[PDB]
Design a binder for this molecule. Sequence first.
Ligand SMILES: CN(C)CCNC(=O)C[C@H](Cc1ccc(F)cc1)NC(=O)[C@@H](Cc1ccc(Cl)cc1Cl)NC(=O)[C@H](N)Cc1ccccc1C#N
Ligand SMILES: CN(C)CCNC(=O)C[C@H](Cc1ccc(F)cc1)NC(=O)[C@@H](Cc1ccc(Cl)cc1Cl)NC(=O)[C@H](N)Cc1ccccc1C#N
Ligand code: NA
Lengths: 302, 302
Amino acid sequence: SGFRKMAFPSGKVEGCMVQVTCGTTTLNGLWLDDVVYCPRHVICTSEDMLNPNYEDLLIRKSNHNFLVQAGNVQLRVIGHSMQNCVLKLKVDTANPKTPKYKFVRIQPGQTFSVLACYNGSPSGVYQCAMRPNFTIKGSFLNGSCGSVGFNIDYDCVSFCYMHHMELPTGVHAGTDLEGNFYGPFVDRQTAQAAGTDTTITVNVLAWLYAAVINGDRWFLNRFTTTLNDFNLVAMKYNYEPLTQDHVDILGPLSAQTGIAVLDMCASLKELLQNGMNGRTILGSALLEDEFTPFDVVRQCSG
Amino acid sequence: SGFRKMAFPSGKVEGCMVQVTCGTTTLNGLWLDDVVYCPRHVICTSEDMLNPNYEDLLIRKSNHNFLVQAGNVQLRVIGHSMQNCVLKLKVDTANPKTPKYKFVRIQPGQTFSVLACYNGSPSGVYQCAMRPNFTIKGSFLNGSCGSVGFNIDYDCVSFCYMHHMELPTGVHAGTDLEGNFYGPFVDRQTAQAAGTDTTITVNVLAWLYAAVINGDRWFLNRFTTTLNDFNLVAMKYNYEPLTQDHVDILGPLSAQTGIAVLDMCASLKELLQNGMNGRTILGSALLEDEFTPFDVVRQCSG
Ligand SMILES: CN(C)CCNC(=O)C[C@H](Cc1ccc(F)cc1)NC(=O)[C@@H](Cc1ccc(Cl)cc1Cl)NC(=O)[C@H](N)Cc1ccccc1C#N
Ligand SMILES: CN(C)CCNC(=O)C[C@H](Cc1ccc(F)cc1)NC(=O)[C@@H](Cc1ccc(Cl)cc1Cl)NC(=O)[C@H](N)Cc1ccccc1C#N
Ligand code: NA
């Protein structure tokens, strides 16, 4: 028992992290087969970053402008090309530790693990949720660009995020591994802002179920509510509306605990209206929304 | 920027996890050089677990009673021996992925990463603190015994914890890699209890400093306090007393922010007496005490 924010084991991804240097800029790349993926702004200088035209900047580059280091061993670039906001560097060696992998794009509300890296060297691992405004609340210092986010499914790594930038408010923005940004952001050094955020309602319920499975029951009640009467309370507290599809995903957790989804909605209605009265749920005094139904199942009986 | 609970990259440890089977019991072992380490209760049956004598039980065993599996590849046991509460199995192969490592015992209040494993296969990574009562609040299901906790220092893995058991209250107890329990627990299936817990004061202050470094300042004040006048407030709220040695460890964080330790103590005095008034610090509505000064430095400028 116990419920903690858990990351995927990072070893399969650690063997893919390299350091890409161009000019005086150095960041991280992802080495799969004979291709290194990294943020395209690595080709920018300090002055180009204000209003770059990346088509221009790449055309003015050649293979010898990019220094690739897999540990102490320098790799040889034999080709380059741009794929939206990521640069692809072809090298003369297939990474012999290349795992089975996929490039997948995730949905707001879904989670992944981040392997934070500096100069091609992994320094830490943690879990993130894609917020409804397509930012993540991560932990990234200068030089962490190119760090990747990923899920793991039976020794297949699904890469879903590459880190590009920090916004003025301290939240983080990146692309999928095809170079397409999450959200309405561009890789240009101008102050952009995220849209307004909301709480992921289905994740909160999943977390309440996790709490019940772990012996926290103080917030339950005998009452029930209708799907429509709950969505009214959601809008008043800036929660996402609950769908009939969300209830079916919560089936396995409802099944295991005996608590119907709409009975747990009634408990959540009361926590929103009353607060917690000094008590905690799984060690938090706030309602947590960064656990998916899948994260709950995977940790509570998986 | 951003501050998250971060684990060490787990790859160096993933290549050391094996599955040890004896009788109908199967759990995880740690394979370093030609030795596999695992919890000794793997030699117990269901009836021996009530009041075992482990000297007796091991003497009645032989090398062919232990099945070791490093993936699909079965390893051959050529010797066995007991080291307090851990069993050591000698095998005919030195693990070729053995990292540079040390066996270290940690202190209450220090943190480490846990690689949770099931049947020799890593399933997740998270951070833990050793509580002052020598338990940890982890996430462990049946079969996770033998999972290890570890820190990393310049590609040297310091192993500090092996998981053995869950207590009635849901907290977890284990040994160091020399087989000596943390705290007053034994590896016998009887209901034991931990001593009473306390908040790690030096970790809370470290976390307040992390919050300042990340732009959270709402809890600061102009007031200051004396070391002795603060220790009085600590005892009233079940916090550990603050030493002169603790203040010097907080030097680097005090230096970086301009806020003296005893000025931050005055801020903590007020949060304890008043609470948070509905506000949060680094995404929490509670005072967090599972970050060391080292974890803060390592993430906020390291
Ligand atoms: C102090 N604290 C409370 C919060 C303060 N918050 C900030 O200081 C972040 C800061 C906010 C900002 C200010 C003005 C702008 F006009 C745009 C953004 N943002 C930047 O410095 C960006 C600039 C950038 C550069 C390149 C592109 Cl394509 C796109 C961009 Cl917007 N730099 C990165 O993001 C680097 N790549 C990696 C990096 C560098 C420094 C710090 C963090 C990170 C990360 N991760
Ligand atoms: C439901 N929820 C709200 C909280 C309920 N809490 C409990 O159910 C844990 C439960 C609490 C307990 C009850 C009676 C006792 F008398 C001693 C302990 N404890 C055990 O089942 C222990 C027993 C054990 C076995 C061997 C030794 Cl050496 C030492 C020990 Cl005390 N089993 C393990 O710890 C296994 N090794 C691994 C394991 C099995 C099942 C569940 C978790 C874990 C873990 N991790
Ligand atoms: Na984590």
